[PDB]
Amino acid sequence: RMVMKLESDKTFPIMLEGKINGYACVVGGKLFRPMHVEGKIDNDVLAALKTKKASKYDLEYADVPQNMRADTFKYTHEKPQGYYSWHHGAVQYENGRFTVPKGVGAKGDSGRPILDNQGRVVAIVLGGVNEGSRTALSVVMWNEKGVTVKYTPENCEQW
Amino acid sequence: RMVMKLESDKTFPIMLEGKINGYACVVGGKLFRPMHVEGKIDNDVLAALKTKKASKYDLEYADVPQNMRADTFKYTHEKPQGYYSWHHGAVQYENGRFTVPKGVGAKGDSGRPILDNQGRVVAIVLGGVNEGSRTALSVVMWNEKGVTVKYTPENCEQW
């Protein structure tokens, strides 16, 4: 199995009346959370931070302080075709599209990052839609030029 | 044992949207609650109680109902020099200052009744200062005449 090598204390949850509602992650010295998750981040230091909005790309992004940048996720643009490691389980990337097995992912799973074999984040999950046996999921990735390409399947239901 | 007195605990967490911000004590037939914390007391009988403010001493005080007047801490007017018990370990009262080992107590760990070997509360902690050697705490003690003398270390932060 490969779940045990996906442990990461950097990722944080956003609660809503004491239940899992969202997931905010620190990548490259920057905190990311989705538009569609409402609540307060569990970490008080990040809750003290003031975040700005980005409606089109569905991301609050905030600048972490100096001490926070010591331990954070690493991002790269290259995405070789094939399988990738996600917190729930394996995912596969083909034809410019991420996808997951059926039923993997539901409400409150948005904001989880996607990891590769060598342990660095390549994209942030926002939602998914059930194509069939495999569930294509909406996810924001990073281009080689660094423009944060947002790929989204048609009539994708929010997670 | 110093922690063998957690059975003596009758404190009530205060929850704000499912988050505990402090503890309210019942000392000497009187309910004491930190002012800086927000939320609702754990039990409904004390939640419905009306509390009178005290800004200078920074807490709310309320008269306990007659039924559970006996079910309370017993106070003490004298504080002999030396080390006492607490939930988070032995804490020493030296030259008028209640000091704990460093790195003990943080945000939300306020309103804790301090105890001695006799199992009687002598002070209530509100906040502290991280002095390099050892952490001193803003406390509310009691003296012989009972005028509620309060001590705050210089440049104190709320807990």
From Swiss-Prot, chains A, B:
Phosphothreonine modification, residue list: T11
Every Peptidase S3 domain range: 10-159
Record PTM Phosphoserine, positions in chain: S8
Site entry (Involved in dimerization of the capsid protein), positions: Y84, N117
Record note on modification: Phosphorylated on serine and threonine residues.
Domain of life: Viruses
UniProt region (Ribosome-binding), positions on chain: 1-10
Subunit structure: Homodimer. Homomultimer. Interacts with host karyopherin KPNA4; this interaction allows the nuclear import of the viral capsid protein. Interacts with spike glycoprotein E2. Interacts with host IRAK1; the interaction leads to inhibition of IRAK1-dependent signaling. Part of a tetrameric complex composed of host CRM1, host importin alpha/beta dimer and the viral capsid; this complex blocks the receptor-mediated transport through the nuclear pore. Interacts with host phosphatase PPP1CA; this interaction dephosphorylates the capsid protein, which increases its ability to bind to the viral genome.
Task performed by this protein: Forms an icosahedral capsid with a T=4 symmetry composed of 240 copies of the capsid protein surrounded by a lipid membrane through which penetrate 80 spikes composed of trimers of E1-E2 heterodimers. The capsid protein binds to the viral RNA genome at a site adjacent to a ribosome binding site for viral genome translation following genome release. Possesses a protease activity that results in its autocatalytic cleavage from the nascent structural protein.
Entry remark concerning the domains of this protein: The very N-terminus plays a role in the particle assembly process. The N-terminus also contains a nuclear localization signal and a supraphysiological nuclear export signal (supraNES), which is an unusually strong NES that mediates host CRM1 binding in the absence of RanGTP and thus can bind CRM1, not only in the nucleus, but also in the cytoplasm. The C-terminus functions as a protease during translation to cleave itself from the translating structural polyprotein.
Protein name: Capsid protein
Lineage of source species: Viruses, Riboviria, Orthornavirae, Kitrinoviricota, Alsuviricetes
Portion of the parent chain present: 117 to 275 of 1254
